[PDB]
Short mmCIF file of N, CA, C and O in Angstrom, two decimals:
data_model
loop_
_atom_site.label_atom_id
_atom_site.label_comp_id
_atom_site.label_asym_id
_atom_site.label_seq_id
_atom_site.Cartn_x
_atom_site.Cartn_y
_atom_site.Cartn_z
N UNK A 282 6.37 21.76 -4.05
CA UNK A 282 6.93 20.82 -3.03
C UNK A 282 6.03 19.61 -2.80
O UNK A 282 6.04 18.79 -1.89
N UNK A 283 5.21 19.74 -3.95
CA UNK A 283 4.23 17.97 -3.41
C UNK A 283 4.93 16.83 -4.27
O UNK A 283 5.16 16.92 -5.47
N UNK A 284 5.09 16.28 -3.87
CA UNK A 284 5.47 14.87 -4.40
C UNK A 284 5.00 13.69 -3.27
O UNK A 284 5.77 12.79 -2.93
N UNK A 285 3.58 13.83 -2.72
CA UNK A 285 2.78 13.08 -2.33
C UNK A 285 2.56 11.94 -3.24
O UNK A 285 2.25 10.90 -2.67
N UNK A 286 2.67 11.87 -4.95
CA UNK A 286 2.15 10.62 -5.52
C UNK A 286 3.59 9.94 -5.35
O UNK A 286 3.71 8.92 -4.67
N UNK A 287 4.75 10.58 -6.04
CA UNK A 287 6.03 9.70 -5.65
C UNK A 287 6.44 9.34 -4.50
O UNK A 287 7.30 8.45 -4.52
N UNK A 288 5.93 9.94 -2.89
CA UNK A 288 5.96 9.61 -1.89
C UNK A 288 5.44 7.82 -2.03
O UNK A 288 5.97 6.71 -1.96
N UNK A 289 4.21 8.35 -2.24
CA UNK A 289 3.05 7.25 -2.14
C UNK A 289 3.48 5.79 -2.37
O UNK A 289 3.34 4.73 -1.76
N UNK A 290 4.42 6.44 -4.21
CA UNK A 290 4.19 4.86 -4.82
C UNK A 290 5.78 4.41 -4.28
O UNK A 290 6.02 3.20 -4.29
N UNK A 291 6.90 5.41 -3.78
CA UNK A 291 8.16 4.78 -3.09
C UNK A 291 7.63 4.06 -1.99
O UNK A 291 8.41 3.14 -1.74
N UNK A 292 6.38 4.05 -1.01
CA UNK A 292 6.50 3.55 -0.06
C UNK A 292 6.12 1.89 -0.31
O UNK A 292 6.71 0.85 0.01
N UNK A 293 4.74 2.19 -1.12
CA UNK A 293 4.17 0.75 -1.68
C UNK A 293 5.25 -0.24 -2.59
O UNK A 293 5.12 -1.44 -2.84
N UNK A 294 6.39 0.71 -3.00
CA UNK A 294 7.50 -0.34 -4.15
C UNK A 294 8.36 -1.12 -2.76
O UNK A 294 8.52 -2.34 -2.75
N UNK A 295 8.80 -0.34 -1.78
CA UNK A 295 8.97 -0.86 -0.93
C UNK A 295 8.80 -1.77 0.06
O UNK A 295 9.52 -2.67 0.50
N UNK A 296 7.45 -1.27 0.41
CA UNK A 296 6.85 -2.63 1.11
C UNK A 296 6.64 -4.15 0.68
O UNK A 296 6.65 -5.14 1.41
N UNK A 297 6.46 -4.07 -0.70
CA UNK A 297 5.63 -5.08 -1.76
C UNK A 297 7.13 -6.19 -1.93
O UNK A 297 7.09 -7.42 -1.98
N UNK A 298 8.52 -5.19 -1.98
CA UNK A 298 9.33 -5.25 -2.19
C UNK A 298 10.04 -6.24 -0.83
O UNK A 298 11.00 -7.01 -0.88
N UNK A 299 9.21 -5.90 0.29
CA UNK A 299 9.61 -6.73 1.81
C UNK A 299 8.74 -7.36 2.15
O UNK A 299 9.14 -8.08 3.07
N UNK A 300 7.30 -7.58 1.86
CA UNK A 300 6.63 -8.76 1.81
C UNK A 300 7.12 -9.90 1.47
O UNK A 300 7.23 -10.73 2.37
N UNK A 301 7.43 -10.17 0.43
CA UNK A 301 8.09 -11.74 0.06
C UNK A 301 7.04 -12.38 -0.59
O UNK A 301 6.04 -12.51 0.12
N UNK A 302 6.97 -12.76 -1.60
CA UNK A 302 6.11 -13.25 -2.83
C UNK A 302 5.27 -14.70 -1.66
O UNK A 302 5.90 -15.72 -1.38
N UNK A 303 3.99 -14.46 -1.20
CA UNK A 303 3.81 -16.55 -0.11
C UNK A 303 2.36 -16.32 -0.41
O UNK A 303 1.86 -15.45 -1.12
N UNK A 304 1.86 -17.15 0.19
CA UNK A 304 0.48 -17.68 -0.03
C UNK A 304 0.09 -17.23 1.06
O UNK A 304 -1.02 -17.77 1.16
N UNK A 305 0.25 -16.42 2.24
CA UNK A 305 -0.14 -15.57 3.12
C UNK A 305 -0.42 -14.09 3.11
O UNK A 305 -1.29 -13.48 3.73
N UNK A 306 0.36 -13.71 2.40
CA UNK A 306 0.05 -12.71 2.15
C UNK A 306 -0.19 -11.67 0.73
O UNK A 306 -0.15 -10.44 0.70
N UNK A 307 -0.47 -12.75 -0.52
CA UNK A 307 -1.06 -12.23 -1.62
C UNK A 307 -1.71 -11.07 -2.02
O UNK A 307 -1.41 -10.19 -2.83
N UNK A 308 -3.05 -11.33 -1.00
CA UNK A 308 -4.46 -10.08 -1.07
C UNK A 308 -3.42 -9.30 -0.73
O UNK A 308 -3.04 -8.80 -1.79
N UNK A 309 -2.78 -8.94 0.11
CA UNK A 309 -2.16 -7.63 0.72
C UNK A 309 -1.12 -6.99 -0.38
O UNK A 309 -0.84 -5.79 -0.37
N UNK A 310 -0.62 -7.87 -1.28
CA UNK A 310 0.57 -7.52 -1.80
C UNK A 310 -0.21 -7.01 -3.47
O UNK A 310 0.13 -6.17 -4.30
N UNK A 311 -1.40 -8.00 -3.41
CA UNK A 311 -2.40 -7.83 -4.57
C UNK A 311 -2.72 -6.17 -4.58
O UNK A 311 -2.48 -5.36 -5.48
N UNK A 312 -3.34 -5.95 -3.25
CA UNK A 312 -3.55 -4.68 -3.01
C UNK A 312 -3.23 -3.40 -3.32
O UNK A 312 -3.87 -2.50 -3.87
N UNK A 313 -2.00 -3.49 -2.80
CA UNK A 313 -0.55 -2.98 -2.74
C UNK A 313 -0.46 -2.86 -4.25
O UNK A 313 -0.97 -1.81 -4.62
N UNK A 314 -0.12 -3.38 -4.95
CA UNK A 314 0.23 -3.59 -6.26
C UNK A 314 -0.64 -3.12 -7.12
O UNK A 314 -0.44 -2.39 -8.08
N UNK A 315 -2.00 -3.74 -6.58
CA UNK A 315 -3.01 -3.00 -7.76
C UNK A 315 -2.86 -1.07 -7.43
O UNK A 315 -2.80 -0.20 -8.30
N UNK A 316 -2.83 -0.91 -6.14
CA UNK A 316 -2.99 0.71 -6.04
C UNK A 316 -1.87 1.48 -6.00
O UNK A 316 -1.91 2.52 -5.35
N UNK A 317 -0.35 1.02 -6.87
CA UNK A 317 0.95 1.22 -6.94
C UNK A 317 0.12 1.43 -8.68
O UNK A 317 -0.35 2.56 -8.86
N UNK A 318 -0.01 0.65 -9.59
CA UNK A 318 -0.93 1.17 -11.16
C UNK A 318 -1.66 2.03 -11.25
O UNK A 318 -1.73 2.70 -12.28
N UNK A 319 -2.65 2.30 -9.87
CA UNK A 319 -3.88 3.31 -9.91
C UNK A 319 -2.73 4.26 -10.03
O UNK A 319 -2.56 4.69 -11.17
N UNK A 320 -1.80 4.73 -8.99
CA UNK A 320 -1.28 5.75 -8.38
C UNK A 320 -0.42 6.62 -9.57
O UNK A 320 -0.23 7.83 -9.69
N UNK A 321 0.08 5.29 -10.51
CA UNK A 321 1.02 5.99 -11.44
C UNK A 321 -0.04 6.37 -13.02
O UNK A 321 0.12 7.34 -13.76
N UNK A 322 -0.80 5.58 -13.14
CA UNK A 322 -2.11 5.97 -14.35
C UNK A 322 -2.94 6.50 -14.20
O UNK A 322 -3.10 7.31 -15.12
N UNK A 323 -4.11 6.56 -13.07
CA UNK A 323 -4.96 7.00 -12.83
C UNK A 323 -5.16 8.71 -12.91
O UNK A 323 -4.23 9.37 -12.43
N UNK A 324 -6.08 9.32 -13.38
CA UNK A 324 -5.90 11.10 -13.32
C UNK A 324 -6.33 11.45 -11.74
O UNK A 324 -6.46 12.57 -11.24
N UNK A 325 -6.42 10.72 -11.39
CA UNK A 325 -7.29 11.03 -9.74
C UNK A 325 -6.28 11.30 -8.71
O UNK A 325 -5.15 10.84 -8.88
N UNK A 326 -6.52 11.93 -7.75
CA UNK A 326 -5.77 12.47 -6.53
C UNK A 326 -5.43 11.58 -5.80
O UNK A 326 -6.02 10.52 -5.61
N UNK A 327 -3.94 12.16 -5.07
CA UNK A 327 -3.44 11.04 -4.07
C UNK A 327 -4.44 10.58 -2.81
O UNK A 327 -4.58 9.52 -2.21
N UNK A 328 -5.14 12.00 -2.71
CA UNK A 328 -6.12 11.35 -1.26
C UNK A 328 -7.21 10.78 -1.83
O UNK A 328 -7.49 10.02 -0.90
N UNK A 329 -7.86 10.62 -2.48
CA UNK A 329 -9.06 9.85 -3.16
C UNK A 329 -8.65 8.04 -3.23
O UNK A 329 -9.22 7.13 -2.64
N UNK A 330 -7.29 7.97 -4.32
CA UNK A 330 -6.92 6.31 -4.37
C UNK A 330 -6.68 6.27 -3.00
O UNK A 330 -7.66 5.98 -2.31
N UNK A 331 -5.44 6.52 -2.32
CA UNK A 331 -5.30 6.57 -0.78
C UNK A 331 -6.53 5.90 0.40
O UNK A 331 -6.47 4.99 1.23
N UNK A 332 -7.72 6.93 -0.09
CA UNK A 332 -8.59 7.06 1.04
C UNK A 332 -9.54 5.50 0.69
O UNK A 332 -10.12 4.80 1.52
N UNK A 333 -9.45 5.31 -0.55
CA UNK A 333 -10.07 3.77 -1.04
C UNK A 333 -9.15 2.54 -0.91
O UNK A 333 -9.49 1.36 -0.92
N UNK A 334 -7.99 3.05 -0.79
CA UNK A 334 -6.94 1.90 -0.69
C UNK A 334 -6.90 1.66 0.84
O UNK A 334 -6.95 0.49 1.22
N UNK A 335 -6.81 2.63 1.75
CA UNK A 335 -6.68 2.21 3.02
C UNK A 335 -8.12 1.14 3.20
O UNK A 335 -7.86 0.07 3.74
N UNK A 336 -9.25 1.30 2.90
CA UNK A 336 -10.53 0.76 3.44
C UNK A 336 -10.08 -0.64 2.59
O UNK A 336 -10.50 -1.62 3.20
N UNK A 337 -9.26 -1.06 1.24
CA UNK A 337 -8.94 -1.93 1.13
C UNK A 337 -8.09 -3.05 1.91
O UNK A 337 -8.36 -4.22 2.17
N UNK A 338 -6.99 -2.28 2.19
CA UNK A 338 -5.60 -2.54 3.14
C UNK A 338 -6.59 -3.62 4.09
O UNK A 338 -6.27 -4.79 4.27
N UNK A 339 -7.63 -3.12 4.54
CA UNK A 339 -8.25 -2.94 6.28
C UNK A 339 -8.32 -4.93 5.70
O UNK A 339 -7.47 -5.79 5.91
N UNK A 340 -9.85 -5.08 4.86
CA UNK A 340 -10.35 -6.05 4.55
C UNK A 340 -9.65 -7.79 4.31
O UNK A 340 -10.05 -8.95 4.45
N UNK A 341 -8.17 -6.95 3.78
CA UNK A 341 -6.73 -8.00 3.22
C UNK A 341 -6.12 -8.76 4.27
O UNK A 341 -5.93 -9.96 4.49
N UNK A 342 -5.84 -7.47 4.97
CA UNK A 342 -4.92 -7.74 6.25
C UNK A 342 -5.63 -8.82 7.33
O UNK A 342 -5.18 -9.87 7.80
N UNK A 343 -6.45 -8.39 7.45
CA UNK A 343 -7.10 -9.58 8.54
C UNK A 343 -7.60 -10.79 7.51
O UNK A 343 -7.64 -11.93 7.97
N UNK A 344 -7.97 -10.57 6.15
CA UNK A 344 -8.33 -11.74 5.64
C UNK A 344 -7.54 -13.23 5.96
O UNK A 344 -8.06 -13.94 6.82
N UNK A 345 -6.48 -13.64 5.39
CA UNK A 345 -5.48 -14.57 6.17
C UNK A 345 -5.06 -14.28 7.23
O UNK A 345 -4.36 -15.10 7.83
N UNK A 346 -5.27 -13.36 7.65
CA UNK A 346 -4.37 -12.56 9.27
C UNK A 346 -3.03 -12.15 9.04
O UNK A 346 -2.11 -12.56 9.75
N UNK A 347 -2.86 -11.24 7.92
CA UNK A 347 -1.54 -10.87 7.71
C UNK A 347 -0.76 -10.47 9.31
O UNK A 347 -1.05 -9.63 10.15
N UNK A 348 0.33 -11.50 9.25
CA UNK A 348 0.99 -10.87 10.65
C UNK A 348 2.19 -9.94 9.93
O UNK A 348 3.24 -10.46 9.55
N UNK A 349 1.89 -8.36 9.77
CA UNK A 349 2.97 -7.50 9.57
C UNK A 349 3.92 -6.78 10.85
O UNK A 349 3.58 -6.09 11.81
N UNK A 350 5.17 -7.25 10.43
CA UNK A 350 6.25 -6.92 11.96
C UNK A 350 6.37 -5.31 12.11
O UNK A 350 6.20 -4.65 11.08
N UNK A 351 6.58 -4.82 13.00
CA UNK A 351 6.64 -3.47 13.44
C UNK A 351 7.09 -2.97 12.16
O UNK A 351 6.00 -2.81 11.61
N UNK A 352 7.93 -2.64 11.36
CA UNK A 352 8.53 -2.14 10.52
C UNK A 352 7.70 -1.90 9.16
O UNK A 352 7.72 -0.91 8.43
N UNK A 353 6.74 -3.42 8.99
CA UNK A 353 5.56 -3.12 8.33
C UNK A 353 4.77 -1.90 7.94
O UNK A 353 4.75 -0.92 7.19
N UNK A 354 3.98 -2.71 9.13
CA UNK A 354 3.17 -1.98 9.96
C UNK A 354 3.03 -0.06 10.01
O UNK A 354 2.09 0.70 9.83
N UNK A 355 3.96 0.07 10.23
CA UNK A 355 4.45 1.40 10.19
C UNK A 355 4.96 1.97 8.92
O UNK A 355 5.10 3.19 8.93
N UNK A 356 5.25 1.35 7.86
CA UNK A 356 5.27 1.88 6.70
C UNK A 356 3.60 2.03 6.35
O UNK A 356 3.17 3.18 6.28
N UNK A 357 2.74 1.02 6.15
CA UNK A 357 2.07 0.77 6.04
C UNK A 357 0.94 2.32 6.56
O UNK A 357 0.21 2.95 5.80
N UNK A 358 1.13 2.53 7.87
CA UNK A 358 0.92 3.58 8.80
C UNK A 358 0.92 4.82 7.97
O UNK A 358 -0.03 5.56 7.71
N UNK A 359 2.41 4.94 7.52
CA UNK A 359 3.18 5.60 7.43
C UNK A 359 2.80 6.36 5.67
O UNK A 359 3.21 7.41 5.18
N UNK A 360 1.89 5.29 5.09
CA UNK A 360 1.31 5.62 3.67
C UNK A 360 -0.12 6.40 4.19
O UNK A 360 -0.43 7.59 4.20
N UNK A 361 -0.80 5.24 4.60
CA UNK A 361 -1.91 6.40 5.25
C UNK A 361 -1.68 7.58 5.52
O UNK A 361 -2.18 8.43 4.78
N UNK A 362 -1.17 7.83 6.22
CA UNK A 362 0.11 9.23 6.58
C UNK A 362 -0.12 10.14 5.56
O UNK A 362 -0.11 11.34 5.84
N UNK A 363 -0.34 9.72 4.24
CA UNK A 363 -0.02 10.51 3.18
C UNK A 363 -1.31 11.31 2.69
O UNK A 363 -1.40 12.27 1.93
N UNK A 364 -1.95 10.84 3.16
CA UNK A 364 -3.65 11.26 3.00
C UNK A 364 -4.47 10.56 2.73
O UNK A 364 -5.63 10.97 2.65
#
Protein backbone atom coordinates (compact mmCIF):
# COMPACT_ATOMS: atom_id res chain seq x y z
CA UNK A 1 0.00 0.00 0.00
CA UNK A 2 2.94 2.60 -0.38
CA UNK A 3 2.80 4.60 -3.22
CA UNK A 4 4.39 7.52 -1.31
CA UNK A 5 6.83 8.12 -4.52
CA UNK A 6 3.67 8.33 -6.96
CA UNK A 7 1.94 10.30 -4.26
CA UNK A 8 4.92 12.57 -4.19
CA UNK A 9 5.58 13.14 -7.86
CA UNK A 10 1.32 13.54 -8.58
CA UNK A 11 1.49 16.33 -6.20
CA UNK A 12 4.70 18.22 -7.62
CA UNK A 13 3.17 17.49 -11.56
CA UNK A 14 0.42 19.34 -10.21
CA UNK A 15 1.53 22.16 -8.58
CA UNK A 16 4.33 22.99 -11.27
CA UNK A 17 1.36 22.43 -13.46
CA UNK A 18 -0.59 25.65 -11.44
CA UNK A 19 2.29 27.78 -11.00
CA UNK A 20 2.30 29.27 -14.45
CA UNK A 21 5.63 29.39 -16.31
CA UNK A 22 6.80 33.87 -14.87
CA UNK A 23 9.80 35.32 -13.75
CA UNK A 24 8.51 35.17 -10.14
CA UNK A 25 8.39 32.21 -9.51
CA UNK A 26 11.09 30.06 -11.45
CA UNK A 27 13.45 28.94 -8.34
CA UNK A 28 10.24 27.44 -6.96
CA UNK A 29 9.08 25.72 -10.05
CA UNK A 30 13.02 25.00 -10.76
CA UNK A 31 12.81 23.23 -7.52
CA UNK A 32 9.83 21.52 -7.93
CA UNK A 33 10.94 20.17 -11.16
CA UNK A 34 14.37 19.35 -10.37
CA UNK A 35 12.98 17.02 -7.30
CA UNK A 36 9.94 15.62 -9.61
CA UNK A 37 13.60 13.80 -11.77
CA UNK A 38 15.23 12.99 -8.38
CA UNK A 39 11.88 11.31 -7.32
CA UNK A 40 11.34 9.28 -10.53
CA UNK A 41 15.44 8.25 -11.12
CA UNK A 42 17.02 8.51 -8.13
CA UNK A 43 17.47 4.87 -6.00
CA UNK A 44 16.96 6.91 -2.78
CA UNK A 45 13.89 7.08 -0.50
CA UNK A 46 10.90 9.22 -0.55
CA UNK A 47 11.82 10.71 2.92
CA UNK A 48 15.50 11.44 2.24
CA UNK A 49 14.75 13.58 -1.41
CA UNK A 50 11.58 14.94 0.51
CA UNK A 51 13.48 15.86 3.66
CA UNK A 52 16.25 17.83 1.26
CA UNK A 53 13.65 19.19 -0.94
CA UNK A 54 11.59 20.75 1.76
CA UNK A 55 14.93 22.71 3.22
CA UNK A 56 15.06 23.65 -0.55
CA UNK A 57 11.30 24.74 -1.02
CA UNK A 58 12.14 27.00 2.33
CA UNK A 59 15.24 29.07 0.56
CA UNK A 60 13.04 29.60 -3.12
CA UNK A 61 9.98 30.66 -1.69
CA UNK A 62 11.04 33.66 0.11
CA UNK A 63 13.81 34.22 -2.45
CA UNK A 64 11.51 36.54 -4.85
CA UNK A 65 8.76 36.21 -2.16
CA UNK A 66 6.82 33.62 -3.82
CA UNK A 67 3.22 34.74 -2.94
CA UNK A 68 1.53 31.07 -3.01
CA UNK A 69 -2.54 31.33 -2.60
CA UNK A 70 -4.10 29.06 -0.01
CA UNK A 71 -4.52 26.21 -2.37
CA UNK A 72 -0.76 26.35 -3.00
CA UNK A 73 0.35 26.50 -0.09
CA UNK A 74 -1.36 23.55 1.12
CA UNK A 75 -0.46 21.29 -1.56
CA UNK A 76 2.78 22.34 -1.02
CA UNK A 77 2.04 21.45 2.91
CA UNK A 78 0.45 18.75 1.83
CA UNK A 79 3.87 17.10 0.04
CA UNK A 80 5.78 17.65 3.13
CA UNK A 81 2.97 15.62 4.50
CA UNK A 82 4.54 12.84 2.75
CA UNK A 83 7.65 12.59 4.75
Amino acid sequence: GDDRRKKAEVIITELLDDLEIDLGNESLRKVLGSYLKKLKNEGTSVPLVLSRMNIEISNAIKKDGVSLNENQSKKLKELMSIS
